[PDB]
Structure 1
Amino acid sequence: MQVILLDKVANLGSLGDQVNVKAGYARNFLVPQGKAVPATKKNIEFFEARRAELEAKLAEVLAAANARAEKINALETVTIASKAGDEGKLFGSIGTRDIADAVTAAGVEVAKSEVRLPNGVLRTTGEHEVSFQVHSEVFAKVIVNVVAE
């Protein structure tokens, strides 16, 4: 494995890689977010020539994970439109896995697919506590507010 690694959160703390690696952070985290550069070792000297022009542009393309860590561990009051079955509960023949899913036909794509639940979420309209991925390595409580849909 020989790549040019380009991220500035979670565990990476370089804006280049010029030698080989025992760990593929490429095709793992950085290629799911369009924020890596490829290498043949034919071009690493060249990359470091190109970097003086490039890096101030490139620094924002490697800001996609930064975004997520920054804007969600902040204190937040998340407004969610949610729906209630006929027993008045948001859980009649719904349960946990439909009370979240809604992006099925309309919207754009979203960065989420798992959250361990140490509490019950999305219970009824009002405030409730929701313990979540403030970043994809870092678990901490956000506040939710549920409104009618």
Structure 2
Amino acid sequence: MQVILLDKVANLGSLGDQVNVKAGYARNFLVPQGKAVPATKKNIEFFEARRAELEAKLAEVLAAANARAEKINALETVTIASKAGDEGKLFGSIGTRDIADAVTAAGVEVAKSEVRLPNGVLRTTGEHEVSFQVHSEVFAKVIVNVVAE
């Protein structure tokens, strides 16, 4: 008896792996109790067509907006900035909605603080390029231009 699994299931389980299980355990518990299925071949494809239409399908459909930064590779228009202070140095910080005020008209409009660099956010020159939260992987690139008024 072989059968492929549905749910987790201990000492073997794996949401759809290919295990070989003792006769009885299956026709007596694993099924007629939803947790696996006779590896009827009609199935080893029926439940492999997933291991293809998925683990190489929707793991490639993850690449549709590379780095998300596609044509933002020449910096964005510096509407305002992000602030300044201390008569030369820096002093004022970024509100829970204040690194957009500059890049405040490019892509789309939002307003949340997925803070990435848990430091006092270095206070010096002004123009930096780290990454910020763009997704579960990639990043982005733009700059910051202060205002002299």
TM-score (norm 1): 0.30
User: What CA deviation, in whole Å up to 9, does each residue of 1:73-114 have, x standing for no partner?
Assistant: 999999997543483344348678636764433235799833
- The share of aligned pairs that are identical, in percent, is 100
Partner of 1:31 in structure 2?
31
Looking at structure 1, the residues matched to 17 and 9 of structure 2 have their Cα atoms a distance apart, in angstroms, of 15
Distance 1:22 1:42, change over 3 A: same
Looking at structure 2, the residues matched to 70 and 29 of structure 1 have their Cα atoms a distance apart, in angstroms, of 53
Preserved CA contact (<8 Å) 1:117 1:131: no
User: What CA deviation, in whole Å up to 9, does each residue of 1:11-58 have, x standing for no partner?
Assistant: 999897999999999999999999999999999984543433543232
Preserved CA contact (<8 Å) 2:81 2:101: no
Distance 1:22 1:107, change over 3 A: farther
- Compute the displacement of 1:9 (Å): 23
Partner of 2:21 in structure 1?
21
Higher relative strand content: 1
Q: RMSD between aligned alpha carbons?
A: 12.5
- Is the radius of gyration larger for structure 1 or structure 2? 2
Looking at structure 2, the residues matched to 33 and 146 of structure 1 have their Cα atoms a distance apart, in angstroms, of 66
Preserved CA contact (<8 Å) 1:129 1:143: yes
- Compute the displacement of 1:71 (Å): 18
Aligned residues: 149
Looking at structure 2, the residues matched to 137 and 49 of structure 1 have their Cα atoms a distance apart, in angstroms, of 27
